[model samples]
Target: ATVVNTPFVAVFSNFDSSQWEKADWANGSVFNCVWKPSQVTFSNGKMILTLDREYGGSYPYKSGEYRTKSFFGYGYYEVRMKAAKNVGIVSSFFTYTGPSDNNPWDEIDIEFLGKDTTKVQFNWYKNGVGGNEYLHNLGFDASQDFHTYGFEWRPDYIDFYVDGKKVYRGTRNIPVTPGKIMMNLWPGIGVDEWLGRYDGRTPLQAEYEYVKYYPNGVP
Candidate 1:
């Protein structure tokens, strides 16, 4: 039941932050949502990614959100982002899949698995569980430029691509759950969890040019 169709809904990053009051996802109170900065910093019109290992002491949940579960189901999720240089820099296109429209829980990822100075990390997740990961170090040199990272979501499987090339594929065997899409950039600490051992002095940065969501029926 997994379908690989283009997006039909109108979910894209189009707001001009240049004219807005940029702060804390533009004050989550007014923007209807907030972006938390624990490991990543956005300033000077760029994202400065920091670090902290998953099991060590640095930064925890260095994530920001321009997200809402208000949109769900079969679709194509894509992010136009740029990565920085360092040790372990990872980013994710996360989503929320909950049965109720109440509280959001359960998530998935079109992840940038483990990054370095000149590459891209492609990781796939289901209900927050990871599988079919890729560390395309210099795979496409996304760091040298911006690339389109996207996923085709179906009822049973998730196929990943970078700059429009098949990189990894996964299935829930573990069917995927519906979720909200969050375009985020985060760094790592010095541990072996979630990309393992991120350094602070040696920082990793990622820039997001834009994000787009396509409907499942767009052939």
Candidate 2:
């Protein structure tokens, strides 16, 4: 029997710490940067996540990550944001849940590989299984201005959109676990083959104008 979980709906025109949590830790095995609470900030009605050259724990860089305090079920997740452009960095908005939350790994990702501001990637995982990676070309530079990126997670399919236009649909194993809405800016350490070699740049930032979630596929 399937259990129906109540959906979580809300809008964040700007970050409210009461409803979100900033990550302050290091996962040195996977990331070259450590998350610092101070690295996440808000200004002029926008939430900003910054990446810089600063020693944090054993990591050589400091970065910012923020996530919702609660989990959200099937719905339309949207954000208006500008990504950080550089080699070996990533700026992303996604939903995730896994062993850390006592749930099987499930996630939906919308990521900008810093090597190319004109392209974005969408991927998802279910029960710890993932391999679905789709790269879409954006007509404009994502680092230059804020644009809308969104995804609709339904029972049968997951659709991705850019500026309100549907770009791709995945009908494979859709993630069933509710997950926390998350955003982050980080530099890749040894994933040079995928994100490109680190160009030794610092002080990269990603800006988010707003975040919205409509429960059960947008009322």
TM-score of each: 0.63, 0.92
Say which candidate scores most in lDDT.
2
Clashes of each: 20, 0
lDDT of 1 at 181: 58
Per-model CA lDDT versus the true structure: 0.51, 0.86
Query: Candidate 2 on 1-219: residue-level lDDT in tens?
Result: 222245443344534568789899885655788899999988867888989888536778899998888888887889889999998888999999999989999999999999999999999999989899899999899999999999999878889989988989998989999888899998887789889987878889999987788766542
**TM-score for predicted model 1 compared with the true structure:** 0.63
* lDDT (Cα, 0-100) at 78 in candidate 2: 90
Error of 2 at 32 (Å): 0.7
Off by over 4 Å in 2: 1-15
In candidate 1, stretches whose alpha carbon ends up further than 4 angstroms from where it belongs are 1-13, 16-63, 98-106, 113-119, 124-128, 136-138, 172-174, 193-196, 202-204, 217-219
Error of 2 at 86 (Å): 0.3
